[PDB]
Amino acid sequence: SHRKFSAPRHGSLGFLPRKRSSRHRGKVKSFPKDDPSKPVHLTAFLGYKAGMTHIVREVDRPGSKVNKKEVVEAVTIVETPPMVVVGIVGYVETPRGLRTFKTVFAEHISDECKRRFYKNWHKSKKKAFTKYCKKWQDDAGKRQLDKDFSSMKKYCQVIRVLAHTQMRLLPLRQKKAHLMEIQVNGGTVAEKLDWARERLEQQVPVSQVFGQDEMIDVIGVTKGKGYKGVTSRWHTKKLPRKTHRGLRKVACIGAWHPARVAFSVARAGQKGYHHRTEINKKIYKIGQGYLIKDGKLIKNNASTDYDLSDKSINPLGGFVHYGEVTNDFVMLKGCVVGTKKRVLTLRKSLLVQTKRRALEKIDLKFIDTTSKFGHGRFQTVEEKKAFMGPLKKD
Amino acid sequence: NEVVTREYTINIHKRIHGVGFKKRAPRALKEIRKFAMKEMGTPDVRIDTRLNKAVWAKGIRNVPYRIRVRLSRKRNEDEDSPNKLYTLVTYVPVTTFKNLQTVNVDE
Amino acid sequence: SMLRLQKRLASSVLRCGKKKVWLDPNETNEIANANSRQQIRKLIKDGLIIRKPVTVHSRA
RNA sequence: CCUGCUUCUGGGUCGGGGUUUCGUACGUAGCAGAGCAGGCUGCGAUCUAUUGAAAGUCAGCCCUCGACACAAGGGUUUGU
RNA sequence: AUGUUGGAACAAUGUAGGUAAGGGAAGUCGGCAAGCCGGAUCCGUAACUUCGGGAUAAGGAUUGGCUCUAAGGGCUCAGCC
RNA sequence: AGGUGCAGAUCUUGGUGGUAGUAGCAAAUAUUCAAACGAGAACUUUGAAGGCCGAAGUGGAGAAGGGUUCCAUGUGAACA
């Protein structure tokens, strides 16, 4: 017979293969398309999740109940050290799809990027790119490099760039940088190729790629949760207490003449560690890293127009399970996919952003830098000192 | 050189965080044998009975968080075995663990 | 060695259970060849096997 | 699956601060203490000061480069 | 010496225990299960009745520690136990 | 001349497979260190520590029933 009372199915089938991700770094499945009118620019960046905190800002949306009112928003902290460009790649375009044409690397590659080409750095002799770097000090080598560059002028349609993150500036335990192809969108192929040739072995800060109050896309891997049942993974109804063979299950799975159990039925398996792509994330603030001028360093990353306090975004005792943020960072509205120390892919939007929400500028009023290692109640260390006063240990 | 005796303090609390009540003390002796093979890498580890009394002094559930250990490597005597060196582990009663480094004591 | 016979014999002579019976762990070879209550009594005088004191149940 | 395993540098252990949880430790002194028994002394729950004190604090928190050893390793395969 | 073995892990489903913000049976054939009350002292206790009961009906208050006071006894009026 | 020919009868007897080195060795809080012995020690013996039975016991003796299971020595062929 038919089902007595209709109800929508549990779980979307668009994220059906709930397996462990074959990759750990987020992958850009579709880069933004390019038009020759725009200048050359980067379209993707790679960051690392630090933590989350509050924010205070003024809302300037017309016609609302919350217009000209102070709100709080959950914001993510993604520490984003600048990249080092180590190579470029060209793509000829085929009737069978998109095919890579030629990959050209730098003359000398930093050892942070050399970590990626080895499964075991301790036992290896670090012999990668040793004969490839001999091509840059012979006259036949330079003519071959220019012939390879001239070949990409003619045949390549899409040009990406190979850039890697900088583990030396991050407080993470690992030292192995993550390589990433970033599509360069801009003018014609020729000036696109010349711009990436100049940018070789150069620092690429975040401000070149992204800006404030801009829709971006976050790509990353879900927090791992291991093997889980249908009640946790698929959020099915719990069976009553009187069930004999258990109650955290799926009661009726399939019909009889459907002699095979279907692919659309909720079954137990791996939950979490799934590759995801979240869109329409708002950048409230692109921060600045620690920098030293006139002897002392500058750390007023949490300073706003009204706070004017020299505190940083690092809370009291630092970020929980991450470390301290010393490099420049981006502040994204709402929670993002992935756990602490998770590599995160930042990407420009694939859609034309013309809305009241996506074009609203943000003016920060107060950034909460209280301790997240419990119920914190102090913004800065010296504010607590002025309240607590002297202690026994003084 | 090879006969080296030195003081050590072990944070038992951080090596027991997670196990059940009926195995806290039986586990607690394991990271003392495991600790002894780390600095002086001798598989033959003998722990003194007074150390076993100190760990079991609060029963099987409550274990002292910090404990002071004289961890000494000595020559293996007759009934010859491939481990030509062994490590003797001795309990050291110390009232407080504030400002205790690893003291390299002498003979 | 193996000393369940001596502990059983030391239980009967001293008129108490084997809980309170203490054998010397260093003179094990001397205790092991007793095999009789007469030589068990000699080990009592020699101090090798000693009755353990009664556990306190203080009324204070 | 994701990391590290000597550029006198790396991590590990301990320790020190930061953060945080609970709530003011033992001992001492008090003419504070319902009072009680022989110039004061003995008992007295509790209170006060030492005392936001004492205790815990990554095992999956944060900075040390304070002290200590350890670290150029062991074994098995892979050819156009 | 832990009931005819151990060690390492702490995934789902289990079996046995618990805790849950707001609602309080809307769940279910059905308050199934779970949960509330609970000892003692002082008040108070209905309809009905075969006057024996109902009845610990129902419904209220108190409970710790310390320091004192009073009362309840034997041996020759006071002393001593 | 016959007790003369099997593929079956949920046939009889006997032997061997897949399952499968799988289900399982999860009712009653708990074991740890050192020494002895031994070729071999998580399980044997001794000492110490931490626990349980908590006198309606996991204690000390009986009746029925069992019948050498009681004691000493030795063994680790078969069982535990």
Side-chain angles (χ1 to χ4, degrees), chain A residues 227-229 241-242 246-249:
Chain A
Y227 190 79
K228 279 292 182 174
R241 186 196 59 81
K242 303 182 64 168
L247 61 83
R248 320 195 81 239
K249 299 144 84 65

Side-chain angles (χ1 to χ4, degrees), chain A residues 285 288 290-291 297-304 308-313:
Chain A
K285 173 195 196 67
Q288 193 174 65
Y290 291 168
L291 73 165
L297 76 163
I298 297 297
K299 65 178 73 175
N300 50 6
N301 310 335
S303 168
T304 67
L308 72 164
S309 170
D310 72 318
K311 56 183 175 62
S312 78
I313 62 169

Side-chain angles (χ1 to χ4, degrees), chain A residues 158-202:
Chain A
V158 181
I159 286 178
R160 309 201 165 109
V161 68
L162 273 172
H164 77 95
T165 70
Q166 197 166 6
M167 295 296 172
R168 187 176 64 244
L169 314 165
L170 293 158
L172 271 72
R173 175 184 193 276
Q174 74 161 343
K175 315 172 182 187
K176 181 180 290 176
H178 295 253
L179 281 173
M180 181 191 194
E181 295 190 339
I182 309 169
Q183 193 167 297
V184 189
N185 285 354
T188 182
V189 191
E191 66 183 1
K192 188 179 303 180
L193 199 49
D194 287 311
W195 190 85
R197 182 169 172 80
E198 179 192 0
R199 286 307 185 283
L200 186 64
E201 299 170 317
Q202 300 301 96

Side-chain angles (χ1 to χ4, degrees), chain A residues 83-136:
Chain A
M83 293 180 183
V84 183
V85 166
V86 288
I88 59 165
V89 63
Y91 281 88
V92 71
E93 196 276 331
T94 78
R96 286 180 288 147
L98 182 77
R99 198 179 79 82
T100 185
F101 185 68
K102 198 158 297 172
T103 312
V104 170
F105 279 92
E107 169 182 36
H108 296 310
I109 297 173
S110 164
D111 291 294
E112 289 180 282
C113 182
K114 302 274 277 293
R115 299 315 202 85
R116 186 54 67 182
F117 315 116
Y118 290 111
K119 286 302 187 179
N120 200 303
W121 182 259
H122 171 55
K123 310 298 290 174
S124 67
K125 281 289 172 50
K126 312 150 183 50
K127 279 281 295 171
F129 287 88
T130 50
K131 301 174 186 171
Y132 179 78
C133 82
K134 303 303 171 300
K135 289 185 178 180
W136 295 74

Side-chain angles (χ1 to χ4, degrees), chain B residues 81-93:
Chain B
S81 195
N83 42 33
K84 292 297 183 181
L85 294 174
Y86 83 104
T87 301
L88 183 63
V89 192
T90 305
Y91 175 55
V92 178

Side-chain angles (χ1 to χ4, degrees), chain A residues 23 51 54 77 79 83 85 87 92 99 104 126 140 143 189 194 205 216 226 228 230 234 240 281-282 313 393:
Chain A
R23 69 200 84 257
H54 310 157
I77 296 299
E79 183 170 5
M83 293 180 183
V85 166
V92 71
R99 198 179 79 82
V104 170
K126 312 150 183 50
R143 290 188 278 102
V189 191
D194 287 311
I216 62 174
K228 279 292 182 174
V230 296
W234 292 103
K281 296 293 192 183
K282 202 156 198 64
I313 62 169
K393 47 193 174 64

